[PDB]
Design a protein around this ligand. Structure first.
Ligand SMILES: CCCCCCCCCCCCCCCCCC(=O)OC[C@H](COP(=O)([O-])OCC(O)COP(=O)([O-])OC[C@@H](COC(=O)CCCCCCCCCCCCCCCCC)OC(=O)CCCCCCCCCCCCCCCCC)OC(=O)CCCCCCCCCCCCCCCCC
Ligand SMILES: CCCCCCCCCCCCCCCCCC(=O)OC[C@H](COP(=O)([O-])OCC(O)COP(=O)([O-])OC[C@@H](COC(=O)CCCCCCCCCCCCCCCCC)OC(=O)CCCCCCCCCCCCCCCCC)OC(=O)CCCCCCCCCCCCCCCCC
Ligand code: HEA
Ligand code: HEA
Ligand SMILES: CCCCCCCCCCCCCCCCCC(=O)OC[C@H](COP(=O)([O-])OCC[N+](C)(C)C)OC(=O)CCCCCCCCCCCCCCCCC
Ligand SMILES: CCCCCCCCCCCCCCCCCC(=O)OC[C@H](COP(=O)([O-])OCC[N+](C)(C)C)OC(=O)CCCCCCCCCCCCCCCCC
Ligand SMILES: CCCCCCCCCCCCCCCCCC(=O)OC[C@H](COP(=O)([O-])OCC[N+](C)(C)C)OC(=O)CCCCCCCCCCCCCCCCC
Ligand SMILES: CCCCCCCCCCCCCCCCCC(=O)OC[C@H](COP(=O)(O)OCCN)OC(=O)CCCCCCCCCCCCCCCCC
Ligand SMILES: [Cu+2]
Ligand SMILES: [Cu+2]
Ligand SMILES: [Cu+2]
Ligand SMILES: [Mg+2]
Lengths: 59, 196, 161, 151, 495, 88, 51, 55
């Protein structure tokens, strides 16, 4: 899932944003069936995810 | 899998601790009730005299207390941990909750047809790892700016200017809601935040 | 002779069990009508006459039941009920005061005018005074109510002794 | 039950029952008497239970109506008032419950189906095709019905 | 038959006998419960199907909002209090202390007929009139005053309904305290009256202290709507309204719950053939819960913008209130032990359901006490799961215990145990399917008071669909069982 | 309701007896607390037929010449009433 | 009935109540440890692979 | 008779059960108070004044 900013005419965007269609900032992290979770939410069993989470200094 | 903020991580860990405590208590009581019921239904272990035990009553009143002070202390510290990041900001954003749409820095955001209920034509953009201050209010009635995946949920009340501190760590789009009855189009007043 | 029962108040059927609810219904529908059409359904004085008339029942039964059915148990029940009612009235007053002082204990405020010193001779004491409050007349009213309270207390003690 | 007036008149202070020849009901507003009959709570039940009978008999039309009104009366009054004031809501409910209304369903399509296990998780869902049109009962979907435009 | 008709009407209108007033309260409570159930079925049918299948227009969601608000008001103020407090309170309180009537016999009738007046005004306002009140059961301004869908007079009529219900409750409370304090028979001290009377006394004390504040809040709303003041406007304090309303709000909750505790204790003494374990402990815990409920009101406003110190304080106070209820639950569990409760009694099994559901609801509500964690759970379906797995599974099942224990006594006909078993078990299973999923749909972000939801939340609403069908079956079973209760045989032959 | 009082069937050739009567029955539902069912098998009786059956059992099992009793249709069974104890 | 097992106060407390509480305490400790390991994945180090 | 006074119906706790319960409760309280208020590593701070950036 990704936010379709190319299908919206005359949409304000920051000057310092990455407009590549497949950039990281256009992903939709929640409220969509994904099969690849990017956010740790309060309903996510990391055990079901084998604790494949990022470190503490990173993130 | 990243967390998207540190405050959300703290809240999640507190939630997990409370869940562990309550599950332990539930298991203890389940074992007790299983023994009691199994004895009862077979017409075993009857004693009309057993209607008082001072030691047991005092102990069972004391025990919940000691296990509860820890929860209370942890919750208070989590609250203050949510609220410390104020004052260390360099960007201000103002948010207005109109009747079934939002306004960010005098730019309107309404639901779109590309997405069913989640997507918006105009998102709200904030920079990653950059502390920001949101000044939230509303024009007509009470709404509630709700992004619970970043640990933000603050009511936009007319005539009351609330001020929350928002911080992002994971880049992407967070979907949120109005989380407060405001009228007919309450269910169609979504919030979109983009951390870039 | 007469067979004597317990000391409680036995209880009588009365029309007040529905007249008071009908009176409340009448008042509230009358207010709704006045809100909607901006004109009363019936004359306010006629409505007040009806309300007064219905409530003259209480004193009649009071007299005729004190003449016949009264003892110390009943008197205590009545006095305790009076105490609870007075408590309710005090709570209502406290609630209205809450609704009053809410925006006065929060001293900082947004004001149309200026209330900073050294810009005018009468601006520092602007936000801090609501001059149009009828001060010495309120003082006279307070004196009247003190007269009433002290006179009534003195007479009550005098008759009790 | 039967009046106790003979005893009341021949009692000990008959002057108290002079009012009983005015417009006055005996049970409600007359001085109770030492030898009065005992009054029960639900007199119908009180008189029927010791004889083994339930108070109401369905074979009697009057009793059937009375019991219907006691149990189902205000319920049906409220339902009738609601249906009279909101005819379209019940019309829409009837349309939906009879499979007449489909929001945006197509022909031959498959739709997601999941029972539990939290929000939509692609590793748990199934996809279902409409058995009604698989059998043949449905070929096209009605469009004359009201459509929630702008949703 | 004119005399007979008028005599019946005078019997049921001029009465002051506590038994008759009690049965009248019970009847009105059951009727209003059924009405609230019908409206709840409408709401559920709206949620289960996709595409505004019932209202068919976004502009007409005001119908759904009206449904939720009247469902809440009907089920809170006319179902539980008339039944839990009005019905058994009037019928039993004079009997359990050995006296004839309540003190102030006339005020009892006045209370009941004030309740009837309120119900009549509410039913006429919200059915026969168009564009009714649609602002949720917590009439938050400026939505309930400065809106476009709330302009008619019937909104003001609903506010006045709230006023009359408050008046009725205050009268009833004063009457209960007074009767229990002075009319006890010789040899019965104040703290030896059975458990139910004490819980009624503390409930009455709760109602007395808070209702005037609710009256002040409602008068504020009426004044804002009518004389066009600015108490709750953009230049007012909608938060002030919330503070007042919720200062009344939580005492109402404990008023609802405590009489259920009293009734369950009494019935347990009657069916397990043993005394209450730590009766003094239970009575003291009840009064503790009553007193502590007056200091926690603002745990319903953690996101309004309260000061950080106040947030911490209210989380603390909510935990404090959580303690004594745990004491009571343990006391119940130990009471049932060593007893000889009937092994095939709907009262016994309803008690079990009450205990389990109340423990679960109390835990879920203890999660919500933490201010920080209330950030993620305020105005989601977690709160709905909480207060329905308490109200509709602990209060409802306590009243089912009382219903199945006091029907034979009042009417003198035994109970059809197999029928009641079907009803209670299907109510248990169906209700759990409806509300349990809500919990995990709240942690997932689904807001409440929405007729249309995102596609991420389908599974929860499918399980809710299942639960709603089971609920329809259970309630039909219940009503038909009661109709069968007062009806003589219909078949009889020779074997 | 008014049906026959309980009787005793007796088969001659086989020489085998047994009590019998009409059992009313109805669909099961809630009972009544203030009512102990009356005598329904033997209506309007003090329930002596049990005593008569108990007394007559020895007479019947021992072998009774019941040729003076009515038959039941075309079968070999005859009806003995239990109004009074049977001695013969 | 005649098969009901009736115990005195002392006998009931000693042979029913106390063992029940003993088993409940065992369940409490075991459940605490196993639940903490179940969620965080470590008995004393909080989340696994994160710290 | 007041049959629930102190002098009557005292049931001593067996030593084995007493020890077991005491150990279980002390262990549970220590473990919870430790893992909740002590093992709180998400409260991480990095002290590095060279990571500041000004244009
Ligand atoms: C429209 C609906 C109106 C309300 C319901 C009426 C049902 C009856 C209808 C009928 O045809 O009755 C004939 C029927 C004739 O009686 P009968 O069988 O010939 O026997 C002669 C005597 O009654 C002698 O018989 P009895 O004294 O033994 O009585 C029989 C026994 C038979 O009853 C029973 O067996 C069951 C009674 C249950 C009572 C509750 C017990 C606790 C709860 C148990 C669980 C059940 C809950 C209810 C059912 C739902 C279950 C899911 O009790 C009753 O029938 C009455 C019991 C009390 C219930 C009805 C109260 C009505 C007056 C109050 C109105 C306000 C509240 C309601 C809302 C309006 O009437 C009655 O039996 C009732 C007496 C008259 C009642 C009316 C009194 C005046 C009320 C004026 C105000 C009206 C409301 C406000 C209007 C404002 C303007 C719009
Ligand atoms: C607070 C304590 C203050 C006193 C401190 C002290 O050193 O006092 C010694 C001093 C010496 O007296 P003593 O020991 O009686 O001496 C007389 C004999 O030599 C010896 O007589 P004794 O030892 O038989 O008398 C005391 C007896 C007293 O016996 C008992 O207390 C029996 C155990 C009762 C536990 C009740 C658990 C309730 C949970 C719900 C259960 C389902 C309902 O035993 C104990 O006190 C030892 C056990 C200590 C408490 C252990 C708690 C374990 C809880 C396990 C269940 C976990 C449930 C998890 C789910 C719920 C979580 C909230 O006073 C006491 O020991 C009595 C203190 C009473 C308070
Ligand atoms: C006591 C109060 C009470 C009771 C009983 C109920 C009963 C039910 N409630 Fe509700 N509910 C509320 C109080 C109650 N509710 C409140 C306060 C709100 C919030 C309003 C708002 O948000 O503004 C609410 C909101 C609410 C919503 C909100 C929808 C939305 O906000 O998104 C939904 C939808 O799922 C719902 C469902 C149900 C269902 C399915 C039942 C029942 O069908 C399930 C149990 C049913 C029973 C069978 C009880 C019916 C009783 C009888 C059968 C009487 C018989 C006699 C006795 C047994 C004594 N309720
Ligand atoms: C119906 C009765 C009822 C009862 C009894 C309760 C009991 C409690 N309720 Fe609630 N509540 C409602 C009815 C009730 N509630 C309603 C109707 C609403 C919604 C209003 C609305 O918004 O419209 C609501 C909403 C509500 C919220 C709103 C959350 C939000 O809106 O932001 C919160 C959060 O603080 C809360 C908390 C509690 C707590 C902490 C208890 C505690 O009393 C629970 C205590 C119970 C126990 C604790 C069980 C005993 C436990 C054990 C056996 C031992 C374990 C003990 C320890 C370890 C200490 N309730
Ligand atoms: C005449 C009536 C009966 C007697 C009245 C006087 C005695 C009343 C004593 C009991 C308390 C009454 C209720 C509370 C009153 C305060 C109102 C309130 O809650 O304000 C909220 C405010 C906070 O609200 P706020 O300041 O955030 O909001 C203000 C409104 N906006 C947001 C629009 C700016 O204060 C507090 O919460 C502080 C704690 C309570 C302080 C109590 C003050 C009253 C003490 C009076 C003493 C002197 C009396 C004699 C002279
Ligand atoms: C060994 C067999 C296990 C039990 C078999 C049934 C469940 C199948 C596997 C469960 C895990 C995957 C979830 C998918 C299905 C869950 C269904 C469900 O109830 O979800 C609610 C809830 C939803 O919660 P959940 O499934 O999200 O649980 C959390 C799961 N993780 C760990 C991923 C976070 O499911 C459960 O609680 C799971 C256990 C269900 C077992 C129910 C047994 C009692 C039956 C009561 C009557 C129900 C009638 C249903 C009739 C259907 C057929 C006619
Ligand atoms: C949401 C908030 C709602 C509002 C909350 C605020 C309170 C609302 C009103 C509550 C009333 C509570 C009354 C408590 C008891 C009062 C004393 C009492 O009952 O005394 C015993 C009796 C009533 O009981 P009784 O008549 O049964 O007497 C029993 C027998 N004796 C007398 C021997 C004890 O009271 C009286 O005799 C007089 C009472 C008159 C009350 C009404 C008169 C005026 C009606 C309104 C007129 C128009 C107004 C505009
Ligand atoms: C026993 C009955 C009294 C109970 C009193 C309990 C007091 C609890 C703490 C009060 C308090 O201050 O709560 C915080 C709440 C809102 O706080 P907030 O406005 O955010 O902070 C000040 C901002 N300048 O503050 C408020 O909302 C103000 C509350 C004022 C006190 C009202 C108490 C009730 C008075 C009427 C009934 C009294 C008898 C019952
Ligand atoms: Cu909104
Ligand atoms: Cu909204
Ligand atoms: Cu509360
Ligand atoms: Mg809210």
């Amino acid at each position: 899932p990704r936010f379709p900013f190319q299908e919206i005419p005359e949409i304000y965007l920051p000057s310092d944003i990455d407009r590549d269609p497949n950039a990281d900032c256009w992903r939709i992290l929640n409220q969509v069936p994904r099969k690849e979770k990017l956010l740790v939410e309060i309903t996510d069993p990391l055990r079901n995810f084998d604790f494949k989470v990022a470190k503490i200094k990173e993130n | 899998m990243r967390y998207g903020n540190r405050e959300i991580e703290s809240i999640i860990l507190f939630f997990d601790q409370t869940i562990i405590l309550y599950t332990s208590i539930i298991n203890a009581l389940i074992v007790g009730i299983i023994i009691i019921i199994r004895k009862w239904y077979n017409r075993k272990g009857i004693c009309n005299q057993y209607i008082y035990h001072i030691k047991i009553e005092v102990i069972w009143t004391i025990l919940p207390i000691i296990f509860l002070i820890v929860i209370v202390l942890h919750s208070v510290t989590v609250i203050y941990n949510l609220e410390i990041n104020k004052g260390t900001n360099n960007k201000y954003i103002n948010v207005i909750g109109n009747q079934w749409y939002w306004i960010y820095n005098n730019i309107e955001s309404r639901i779109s047809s590309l997405g069913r209920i989640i997507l918006v034509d105009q998102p709200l953009f904030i920079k990653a790892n950059n502390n920001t201050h949101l000044i939230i209010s509303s024009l007509d009635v009470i709404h509630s700016f709700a992004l619970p995946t970043l640990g933000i949920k603050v009511d936009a009340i007319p005539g009351r200017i609330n001020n929350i501190s928002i911080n992002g760590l994971t880049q992407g789009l967070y979907v949120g809601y109005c989380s407060e009855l405001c009228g007919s189009g309450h269910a169609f007043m979504p919030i979109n935040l983009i951390v870039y | 002779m007469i067979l004597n029962t317990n000391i409680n108040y036995g209880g009588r059927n009365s029309r007040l069990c529905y007249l008071i609810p009908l009176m409340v219904h009448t008042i509230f529908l009358y207010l709704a009508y006045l809100i909607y059409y901006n004109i009363n359904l019936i004359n306010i004085y006629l409505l007040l006459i009806i309300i007064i008339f219905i409530n003259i029942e209480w004193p009649l039964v009071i007299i005729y039941e004190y003449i016949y059915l009264t003892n110390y148990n009943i008197q205590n029940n009545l006095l305790y009920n009076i105490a609870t009612f007075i408590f309710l009235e005090i709570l209502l007053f406290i609630g209205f005061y809450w609704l009053y002082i809410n925006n006065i204990i929060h001293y900082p405020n947004n004001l149309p005018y200026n209330n900073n010193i050294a810009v005018n001779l009468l601006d520092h004491l602007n936000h801090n005074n609501n001059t149009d409050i009828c001060l010495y007349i309120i003082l006279h009213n307070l004196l009247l109510l003190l007269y009433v309270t002290l006179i009534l207390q003195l007479v009550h003690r005098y008759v009790q002794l | 039950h039967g009046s106790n007036l003979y005893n009341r008149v021949h009692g000990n202070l008959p002057q108290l029952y002079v009012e009983q020849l005015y417009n006055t009901d005996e049970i409600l507003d007359t001085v109770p008497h030492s030898s009065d009959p005992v009054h029960h709570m639900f007199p119908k039940c009180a008189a029927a239970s010791p004889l083994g009978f339930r108070p109401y008999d369905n074979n009697k039309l009057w009793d059937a109506f009375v019991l219907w009104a006691i149990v189902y009366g205000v319920t049906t009054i409220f339902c009738v008032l609601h249906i009279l004031k909101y005819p379209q809501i019940w019309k829409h409910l009837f349309e939906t419950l009879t499979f007449q209304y489909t929001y945006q369903r197509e022909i031959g399509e498959e739709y997601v189906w999941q029972y539990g296990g939290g929000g939509l998780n692609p590793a748990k869902w199934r996809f279902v095709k409409s058995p009604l049109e698989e059998l043949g009962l449905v070929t096209e979907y009605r469009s004359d019905l009201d459509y929630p435009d702008d949703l | 038959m004119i005399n007979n008709i008028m005599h019946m009407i005078n019997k049921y209108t001029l009465t002051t006998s506590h038994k008759i007033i009690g049965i009248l309260y019970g009847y009105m409570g059951y009727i209003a419960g059924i009405l609230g159930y019908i409206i709840s079925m409408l709401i559920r049918m709206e949620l289960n199907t996709q595409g505004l299948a019932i209202v068919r227009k976004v502009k007409e969601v005001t119908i759904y909002n009206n449904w939720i608000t009247i469902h809440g008001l009907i089920m809170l103020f006319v179902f539980i209090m008339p039944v839990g407090i009005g019905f058994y309170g009037n019928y039993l309180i004079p009997m359990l202390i050995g006296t004839s009537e309540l003190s102030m016999p006339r005020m009892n009738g006045i209370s009941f007929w004030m309740l009837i007046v309120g119900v009549v005004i509410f039913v006429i306002s919200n059915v026969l009139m168009s564009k009714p009140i649609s602002s949720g059961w917590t009439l938050y301004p400026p939505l309930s005053t400065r809106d476009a869908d709330n302009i008619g007079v019937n909104i003001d009529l609903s506010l006045l309904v709230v006023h009359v219900l408050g008046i009725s409750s205050t009268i009833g409370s004063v009457n209960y305290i007074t009767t229990n304090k002075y009319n006890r028979h010789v040899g019965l001290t104040f703290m030896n009256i059975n458990i139910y009377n004490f819980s009624i006394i503390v409930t009455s004390i709760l109602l007395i202290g808070s209702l005037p504040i609710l009256g002040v809040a409602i008068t504020g709303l009426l004044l804002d709507r009518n004389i066009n003041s600015t108490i709750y406007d953009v230049i007012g304090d909608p938060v002030l309204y919330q503070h007042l309303f919720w200062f009344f709000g939580h005492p109402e909750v404990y008023v609802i719950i405590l009489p259920v505790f009293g009734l369950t204790s009494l019935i347990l003494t009657s069916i397990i053939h043993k005394d209450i374990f730590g009766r003094e402990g239970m009575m003291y815990c009840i009064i503790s819960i009553g007193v502590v409920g007056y200091f926690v009101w603002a745990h319903h406003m953690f996101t309004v913008g309260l000061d950080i110190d106040s947030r911490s304080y209210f989380s603390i106070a909510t935990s404090i209130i959580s303690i004594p209820t745990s004491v009571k639950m343990f006391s119940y569990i130990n009471t049932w032990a060593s007893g000889r409760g009937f092994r095939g009694n709907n009262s016994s099994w309803s008690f079990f359901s009450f205990l389990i559901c109340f423990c679960f609801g109390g835990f879920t509500g203890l999660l919500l006490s933490s201010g920080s964690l209330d950030i993620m759970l305020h105005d989601t379906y977690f709160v709905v799961g909480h207060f329905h797995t308490v109200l509709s599974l602990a209060a409802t099942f306590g009243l089912l215990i009382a219903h199945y224990f006091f029907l034979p006594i009042i009417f003198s006909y035994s109970i059809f145990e197999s029928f009641s078993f079907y009803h209670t078990f299907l109510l248990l299973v169906g209700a759990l399917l409806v509300f349990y999923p809500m919990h995990l749909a709240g942690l997932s972000g689904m807001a409440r008071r929405v007729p249309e939801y995102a596609d991420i939340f389908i599974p929860f609403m499918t399980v809710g669909f299942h639960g709603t069908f089971l609920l329809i079956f259970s309630t039909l079973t219940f009503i038909r069982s009661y109709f069968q209760f007062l009806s003589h045989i219909n078949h009889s032959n020779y074997l | 309701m008014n049906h026959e009082r309980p009787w005793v069937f007796l088969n001659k050739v086989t020489g085998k007896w047994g009590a019998c009567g009409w059992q009313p029955f109805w669909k099961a539902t809630s009972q009544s607390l203030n009512y102990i069912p009356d005598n329904f098998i033997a209506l309007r009786t003090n329930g002596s037929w049990v005593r008569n059956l108990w007394q007559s059992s020895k007479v019947l099992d021992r072998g009774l010449n019941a040729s003076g009793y009515p038959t039941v249709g075309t079968t070999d069974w005859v009806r003995i009433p239990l109004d009074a104890p049977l001695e013969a | 009935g005649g098969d009901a097992e009736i115990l005195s106060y002392t006998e009931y407390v000693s042979t029913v109540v106390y063992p029940t509480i003993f088993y409940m305490a065992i369940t409490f400790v075991v459940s605490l440890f196993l639940m903490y390991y179940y969620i965080y994945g470590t008995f004393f180090s909080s989340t696994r692979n994160r710290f | 008779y007041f049959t629930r006074v102190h002098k009557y119906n005292h049931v001593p706790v067996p030593f084995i059960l007493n020890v077991g319960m005491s150990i279980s409760i002390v262990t549970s309280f220590v473990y919870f108070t430790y893992t909740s208020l002590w093992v709180r590593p998400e409260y991480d701070r990095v002290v590095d004044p060279s990571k500041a950036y000004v244009n």
